[PDB]
Amino acid sequence: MTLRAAVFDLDGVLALPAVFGVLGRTEEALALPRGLLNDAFQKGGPEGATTRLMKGEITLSQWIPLMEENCRKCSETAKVCLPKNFSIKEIFDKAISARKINRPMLQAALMLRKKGFTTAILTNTWLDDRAERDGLAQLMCELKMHFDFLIESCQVGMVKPEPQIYKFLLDTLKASPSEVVFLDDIGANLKPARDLGMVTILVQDTDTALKELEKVTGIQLLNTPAPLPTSCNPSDMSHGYVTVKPRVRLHFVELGSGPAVCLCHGFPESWYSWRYQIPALAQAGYRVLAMDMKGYGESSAPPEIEEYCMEVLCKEMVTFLDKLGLSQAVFIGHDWGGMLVWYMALFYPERVRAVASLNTPFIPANPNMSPLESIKANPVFDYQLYFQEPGVAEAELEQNLSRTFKSLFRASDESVLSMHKVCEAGGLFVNSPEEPSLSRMVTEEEIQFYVQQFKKSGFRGPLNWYRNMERNWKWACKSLGRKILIPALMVTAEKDFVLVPQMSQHMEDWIPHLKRGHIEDCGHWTQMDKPTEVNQILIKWLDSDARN
Amino acid sequence: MTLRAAVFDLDGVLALPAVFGVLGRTEEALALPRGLLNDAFQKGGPEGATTRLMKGEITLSQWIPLMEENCRKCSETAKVCLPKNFSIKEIFDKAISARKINRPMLQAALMLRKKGFTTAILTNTWLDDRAERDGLAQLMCELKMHFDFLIESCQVGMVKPEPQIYKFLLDTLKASPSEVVFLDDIGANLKPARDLGMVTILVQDTDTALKELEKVTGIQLLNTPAPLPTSCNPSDMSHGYVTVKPRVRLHFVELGSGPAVCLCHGFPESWYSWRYQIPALAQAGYRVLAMDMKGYGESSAPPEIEEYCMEVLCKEMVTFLDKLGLSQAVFIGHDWGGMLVWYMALFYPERVRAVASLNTPFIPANPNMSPLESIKANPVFDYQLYFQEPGVAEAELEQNLSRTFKSLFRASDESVLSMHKVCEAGGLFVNSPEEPSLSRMVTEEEIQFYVQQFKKSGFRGPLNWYRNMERNWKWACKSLGRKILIPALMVTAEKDFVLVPQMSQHMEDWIPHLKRGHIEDCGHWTQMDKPTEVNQILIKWLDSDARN
Numbered sequence A, B: 001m002t003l004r005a006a007v008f009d010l011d012g013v014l015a016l017p018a019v020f021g022v023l024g025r026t027e028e029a030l031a032l033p034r035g036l037l038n039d040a041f042q043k044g045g046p047e048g049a050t051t052r053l054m055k056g057e058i059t060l061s062q063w064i065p066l067m068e069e070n071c072r073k074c075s076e077t078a079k080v081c082l083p084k085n086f087s088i089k090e091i092f093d094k095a096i097s098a099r100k101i102n103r104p105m106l107q108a109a110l111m112l113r114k115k116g117f118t119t120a121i122l123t124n125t126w127l128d129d130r131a132e133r134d135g136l137a138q139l140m141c142e143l144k145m146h147f148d149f150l151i152e153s154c155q156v157g158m159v160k161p162e163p164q165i166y167k168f169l170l171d172t173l174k175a176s177p178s179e180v181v182f183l184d185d186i187g188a189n190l191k192p193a194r195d196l197g198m199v200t201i202l203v204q205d206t207d208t209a210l211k212e213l214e215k216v217t218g219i220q221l222l223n224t225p226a227p228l229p230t231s232c233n234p235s236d237m238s239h240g241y242v243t244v245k246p247r248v249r250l251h252f253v254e255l256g257s258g259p260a261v262c263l264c265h266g267f268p269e270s271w272y273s274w275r276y277q278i279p280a281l282a283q284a285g286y287r288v289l290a291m292d293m294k295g296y297g298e299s300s301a302p303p304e305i306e307e308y309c310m311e312v313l314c315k316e317m318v319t320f321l322d323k324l325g326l327s328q329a330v331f332i333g334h335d336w337g338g339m340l341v342w343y344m345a346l347f348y349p350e351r352v353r354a355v356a357s358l359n360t361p362f363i364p365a366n367p368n369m370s371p372l373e374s375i376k377a378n379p380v381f382d383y384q385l386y387f388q389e390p391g392v393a394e395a396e397l398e399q400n401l402s403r404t405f406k407s408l409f410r411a412s413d414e415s416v417l418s419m420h421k422v423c424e425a426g427g428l429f430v431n432s433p434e435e436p437s438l439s440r441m442v443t444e445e446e447i448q449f450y451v452q453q454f455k456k457s458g459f460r461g462p463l464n465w466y467r468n469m470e471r472n473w474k475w476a477c478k479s480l481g482r483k484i485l486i487p488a489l490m491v492t493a494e495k496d497f498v499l500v501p502q503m504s505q506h507m508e509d510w511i512p513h514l515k516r517g518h519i520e521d522c523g524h525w526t527q528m529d530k531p532t533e534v535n536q537i538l539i540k541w542l543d544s545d546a547r548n
Ligand SMILES: C[C@]12CC[C@@H]3c4ccc(O)cc4C[C@@H](CCCCCCCCC[S@@](=O)CCCC(F)(F)C(F)(F)F)[C@H]3[C@@H]1CC[C@@H]2O
Pocket: A267, A268, A310, A335, A336, A339, A360, A363, A364, A365, A366, A371, A374, A375, A383, A408, A428, A469, A472, A473, A476, A498, A499, A524
């Protein structure tokens, strides 16, 4: 009554198992005198080597010998001999990579931050200059995105339980002592907090710690449902810009290091449709290049229809790689991005490390029949005839941008359109609501981002993708001799009623080594409908097929 | 009289050794009947499997079995048995990675393109879907940057020596038959060219081919001096944008895949100062992020002096990594970038994969003496006192932007300034020319790029880097306990008279494993003065120390 901020210790609170645990275990393993190693660590007290380390006076690699000094003469006071193969670097290396994020604590912090809490990490830690310091660096990267502040002892020159660092914390949070909970696995670090008037929590096991936190904050933290993957705030993203042609510039969002993964969105979407998988895939060891496909967002949207036929579209993606200096990327696509992705594989497989499509099956061209005839045969594609005459489909979709996306971006059990007889009634929205309810898949804010984006170039660019049926037919017919023998994945969505899974049923004919994925209760808008299981599928397939 | 275009075959002209050579060699190795393999390759003629392959009807992996079919029954006509361990995939894999760019031909083409020729590659080649097709993909990437067109048979559905493809070529070059030379290692591909009125050259050995080309073009191609590394045209580059703070956005150019290499330029420069090493390093297997440092170019240039002290500068580079999703990058710096780079290592070594500096030595702070006193002691730093009073140094450097860079960017034997008594005379240019001659290091065009860039935010941002001596002194003093134990390089420039090499002489005290480099006849502007030997040094050290 009333907290506003949450401060989490790192070792033994946000990250487990703690590194003090690898003191005690090593001793028992080596049958060393109880303590010894822990006595060497704490040797010297406030003026000891470990306190200098934690204040950033010296680096971890400077400390290793100083720590061994302490283990040499702690063992000489008890007249004990160190073991033949002792390496305090080796012990501490293992402890550090063994340490991993305590997931239920990290969720608990997100939850509190979702509800208006100012969260921060307060940790005694070190300037890590070891050969394998990249391990911890990643751990710290993943963590810090989720907190307003990361206060490390070696960066600020102050260390727990010194009262001064707590005053720093308060000053940094811009909050009074009784407005902040501080959780830590050490009694001594809580006393100074309590003295300023802070609520503290002695963290032993994680579950009991949350109960306390839960109780004192009055917000459900334990047992809450599995939360969504990390989303992307556009202004934190790295934005990239490549001109591939006189008046064609492609825009993309970049995040991660590793093999290039190029995400190609569908109709009527944007790079932001991959908001749930950009961070995930980065995290999985990949360099995500999430595209604004030509016609959309901050990519160019030149008026000409011809500019959006698959061939020119594909060539431009090649030029995009060329200018970025990439010999390959693994292309992953959805809806129209899917179609295009498959064609990159068939026409430029030297540039495609691997290929993957959500929802969109690879269907080869029918060399006898023209596709404009085939699409009249199947009434679920009746909306595509409507999209043919330039200007008509634009007027409606632009009439009210908000209404348009709210109406489109819905789960399969939230349908608000009649699918067929679209030319019949003359409009996609004819008998649809002006102010539709907000779908469970998308917040108000996420919609308005799409709204923002389509205010630049509208729907002429996007719709033109449907206006090169004949031209793409002729092109694809050149590939009818070919097959796909590079790694390929097909993810089907049970309840995509327009890109039905049955359409993919013959795909192993032209792609014999095709791997598959399937999602129950999944509409057309796969990525925001089932982001958790999409990432799970894609990462697994990336790690197994797209690298090693 | 007069050519305007040059067309180069790939296999056996721009890339050696040719893949037909790995037909003949394999036969001799295996004591196979003369021909056999070559007979299987050409089997079927215009309607054979190999002709289908070259037209993009089928992929390379589709062709392997069809080629083995032909090697099964070519050997059965002579009643011969194939060897126990025959694998026509294995033979062709080796041939393809063994094939490498014929460097003197590639130079010859650049030269011709430098002199107004429209260059193009005309090659019979294939849709490569092998497991190891990334090898050839890179080879093709490196090549195509240097040519206006790359015309592959499998992309256009036409093959040499079909007359139609030559007509395509002419149409693509927008040039008449007698305005184009076509070089190829096969007689049959020259006849159709000659019939339209083309000049041809039968390429056997490379040297004799150039003599012919040389003779018919009337431009020195053989024996010409070692040309400069590939430079960067800004509009072909990928441009990146990250906001690291409310009103601070960092801009960078990106090229390459692999470990992150972050290039930090000096005063008064830009990302473009690394124009010679961006492509090189990309090529060496690295992902180059060439920065516009805060205060410069399309990066923000906020007025406040404090915004350019090393600490905030460094933190922002950390945030830059954070938002790009990078746990580390290898930071390489020059002049002021150098100083900053060293401090990243001392304050954030978990984020620095390795560290490197051109010219700028690491000198630790003198904890007793304030640096503003030290800089008056040494008259070569007299220009830095001049840079202290806000506004004065700006007025002069902005007075004439062209004059300013022309005056600065000069080699050591082209000096046009008096170095000391700068406060004395009151100006960097006091007794310097209004229209200086154009330095051998920089074309007119390269200067005007710098001019363009500094028209945005001028010199307030840049100069402020020199205006936090006291604040950076206090900061650096915190590191006086530390050492640098991550991989580190120091490149010294013989004739940098302001960043003299002797300044670096004690650096192994705080950086015991420091590796070194030195360049003779090298001024302060290392990168454009000696771009060839800079890349050589940096790539070697990157490959040895920054990876494996
Ligand atoms: C398989 C096919 C013959 C070959 C056709 C073909 C071949 C090559 C090519 O480049 C295009 C096509 C058209 C295709 C059209 C099939 C594409 C299937 C859809 C994949 C593209 C994007 C689906 S996107 O419009 C769904 C958006 C729904 C929605 F956004 F909610 C909307 F608001 F309703 F629009 C091929 C024909 C379909 C039936 C016929 O048997």
